[PDB]
């Protein structure tokens, strides 16, 4: 599977930006673009050897972990640290079979009891997304945490917090130029901070956005989708145009 | 284009 590398050590706005653009460019073929928004590969019929991309993360601590992302939804399904690999609990048999193809030379494989959806991770972590800081400092911490789970050094709530940091700074940032932007701003200003409601509500709505755009009537939505501004106020989007700067990838819905 | 959230 293709491997895309990022290191927090000496990270800049340009090196993060280029990383996210490489992830996007390896997730999609670029042949399928609707409303100027690229569509990810269709799960149905997708050959196993095209199913996954790997993201190798390194940090100042000189530790490395490799995440596996499903090309069908850009989301993290598991990771490797050294000679151990760890997978979220698959939703079904076919996804269970699919993950057997990842990290196959590793000596210890484990499937967690819990899936990798946010509600489950936030419970394990004992913190919601709105209370977990993101930025290059958090990501450096999170890479160490996932590495030291393989040694016994990381406890479950820290591991779950660290998944939440990685999924937002990698998967969600690939899905949304707006979220890639939030991370670029944190790196620019050397800040760490939690996401605001606008970010959280977009993450929660990605699947529904994908469907509203792809089943739209030449860009016009059959019904509105509610999002949230940074101050938490709600508002409605009625068509694709205002989302083209915001959403970078969509899950495949229809031909 | 990120103005919609401000």
Residue numbers in the entry:
A (entry chain A): 6 to 260
B (entry chain C): 2 to 7
Publication passage describing the model:
Ricin is a well-known type 2 ribosome-inactivating protein (RIP) discovered in the late 19th century in the seeds of Ricinus communis. Ricin hydrolyzes the N-glycosidic bond at adenine−4324 in the 28S rRNA of eukaryotic ribosomes. This adenine is located at a GAGA hairpin within the sarcin/ricin loop, which is highly conserved in all large ribosomal subunits and is essential for the proper assembly of the functional core of the large subunit. RTA can specifically recognize and bind to the C-terminus of human ribosomal stalk protein both in vitro and in vivo to facilitate its ribosome-inactivating activity.
To further decipher the molecular interaction between RTA and P2, we co-crystallized RTA in complex with a synthetic peptide C11-P2 (SDDDMGFGLFD) and C9-P2 (DDMGFGLFD), respectively. The structure of the RTA-C9-P2 complex and RTA-C11-P2 complex were solved to a resolution of 1.6 Å and 2.3 Å, respectively. Each asymmetric unit of the crystal structure contains two molecules of RTA with an overall root-mean-square deviation (RMSD) of 0.195 Å over 255 Cα atoms. Refinement was first performed on RTA, and then C9-P2 peptide was manually built, each molecule of RTA forms a 1:1 complex with C9-P2 peptide. For C9-P2 and C11-P2 peptide, only the last 6 residues (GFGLFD, C6-P2) could be fitted to the observed electron density, while N-terminal residues DDM and SDDDM were not defined in the final model. The C6-P2 peptide binds to the C-terminal domain of RTA, which is composed of 11 key residues Q182, Y183, S203, L207, Q233, R234, R235, F240, I247, P250 and I251, providing a major hydrophobic interface via main-chain and side-chain interactions, while only R235 contributing one key hydrogen bond contact for C6-P2 peptide binding. The P2 binding pocket of RTA is hydrophobic and is composed of six hydrophobic residues (Y183, L207, F240, I247, P250 and I251) and five polar residues (Q182, S203, Q233, R234 and R235) to form non-bond contacts to accommodate C6-P2 peptide. However, C6-P2 binds to RTA in a distinguished manner, adopts a different orientation and is seriously distorted when compared with C11-P2 in the TCS-C11-P2 complex. In the RTA-C6- P2 structure, it revealed that R235 and R234 participate in interacting with F10 and D11 other than interacting with the M5 and G6 in the docking model. Our structure of RTA-C9-P2 only captured the electron density of C6-P2; this may be caused by the flexibility of the N-terminal of P2, which was also observed in our previous structural study of TCS-C11-P2 complex.
